[PDB]
């Protein structure tokens, strides 16, 4: 089966900016989910080999994880906050697609998503 390369975390042909929303996404939103007790399985791409999940990248063709999101924020990969929020949504949806309901990992994703939405609700205004 084997893993794909991780998602892109840099792009030399994309302009860059630091904004209030992006800073909040790293310092408050990502930081808060990162330190959650359920965070670790989502802190890096799913290693289908080590975990023995050979069909993972057959089923999930748009992988995403918080390690990638963190690196994207640190590398100024996102221009719009929406890009980052979309990546979180993709991560959670992947989990709901690949795993079975009631799997420990699905409940963990549910709790993390609730927390995520709580924090996105207090995102500072665009400007
Ligand atoms: C360091 O990464 C991990 C740590 N702990 C757990 C996982 C993990 C394990 N199993 C998964 N799926 C199986 C659960 C039991 N039923 C068959 C599928 C996982 N699925 C996922 O989507 C993620 C993100 C982690 C994971 C990854």
From Swiss-Prot:
Subcellular location: Nucleus; Chromosome
Record PTM text: Phosphorylation by CK2 disrupt the intramolecular binding between the bromo domain 2 and the NPS region and promotes binding between the NPS and the BID regions, leading to activate the protein and promote binding to acetylated histones. In absence of phosphorylation, BRD4 does not localize to p53/TP53 target gene promoters, phosphorylation promoting recruitment to p53/TP53 target promoters.
Cross-link Glycyl lysine isopeptide (Lys-Gly) (interchain with G-Cter in SUMO2), sequence positions: 58
Site (Acetylated histone binding): 99
Tissue expression notes: Ubiquitously expressed.
Taxonomy, superkingdom: Eukaryota
Domain Bromo span(s) in chain numbering: 17-123
Family: Belongs to the BET family.
Job description of the protein: Chromatin reader protein that recognizes and binds acetylated histones and plays a key role in transmission of epigenetic memory across cell divisions and transcription regulation. Remains associated with acetylated chromatin throughout the entire cell cycle and provides epigenetic memory for postmitotic G1 gene transcription by preserving acetylated chromatin status and maintaining high-order chromatin structure. During interphase, plays a key role in regulating the transcription of signal-inducible genes by associating with the P-TEFb complex and recruiting it to promoters.
General remark: JQ1, a thieno-triazolo-1,4-diazepine derivative, and I-BET, a benzodiazepine derivative, have been tested on tumors with success. Treatment with GSK1210151A (I-BET151, a I-BET derivative) has strong effets on mixed lineage leukemia and promotes myeloid differentiation and leukemia stem-cell depletion.
Disease: Cornelia de Lange syndrome 6: A form of Cornelia de Lange syndrome, a clinically heterogeneous developmental disorder associated with malformations affecting multiple systems. It is characterized by facial dysmorphisms, abnormal hands and feet, growth delay, cognitive retardation, hirsutism, gastroesophageal dysfunction and cardiac, ophthalmologic and genitourinary anomalies. CDLS6 inheritance is autosomal dominant.
Domain free text: The NET domain mediates interaction with a number of chromatin proteins involved in transcription regulation (NSD3, JMJD6, CHD4, GLTSCR1 and ATAD5).
Record's subunit section: Interacts with p53/TP53; the interaction is direct. Interacts (via CTD region) with CDK9 and CCNT1, acting as an associated component of P-TEFb complex. Interacts with RELA (when acetylated at 'Lys-310'). Interacts (via NET domain) with NSD3, CHD4, BICRA and ATAD5. The interaction with BICRA bridges BRD4 to the GBAF complex. Interacts (via NET domain) with JMJD6 (via JmjC and N-terminal domains); the interaction is stronger in presence of ssRNA and recruits JMJD6 on distal enhancers. Interacts with NSD3. Interacts with NIPBL. (Microbial infection) Interacts with bovine papillomavirus type 1 regulatory protein E2. This interactions may serve for the tethering of viral genomes to host mitotic chromosomes allowing successful partitioning of the viral genome during cell division.
Protein name per Swiss-Prot or TrEMBL: Bromodomain-containing protein 4
The gene coding this protein: BRD4
Residue span relative to the full protein: 44 to 168 of 1362
């Amino acid at each position: 089966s084997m893993n794909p390369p991780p998602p892109e975390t840099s792009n030399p042909n994309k302009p860059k900016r630091q904004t209030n929303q992006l800073q909040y996404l790293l310092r408050v939103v990502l930081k808060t989910l990162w330190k959650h007790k359920f965070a670790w399985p989502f802190q890096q791409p799913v290693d289908a080999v080590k975990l023995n999940l050979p069909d993972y990248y057959k089923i999930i063709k748009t992988p995403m994880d918080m390690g990638t999101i963190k690196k994207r924020l640190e590398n100024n990969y996102y221009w719009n906050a929406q890009e980052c929020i979309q990546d979180f949504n993709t991560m959670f949806t992947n989990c709901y697609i690949y795993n079975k309901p009631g799997d420990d990992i699905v409940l963990m994703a549910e709790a993390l998503e609730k927390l995520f939405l709580q924090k996105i609700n207090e995102l500072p205004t665009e400007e």
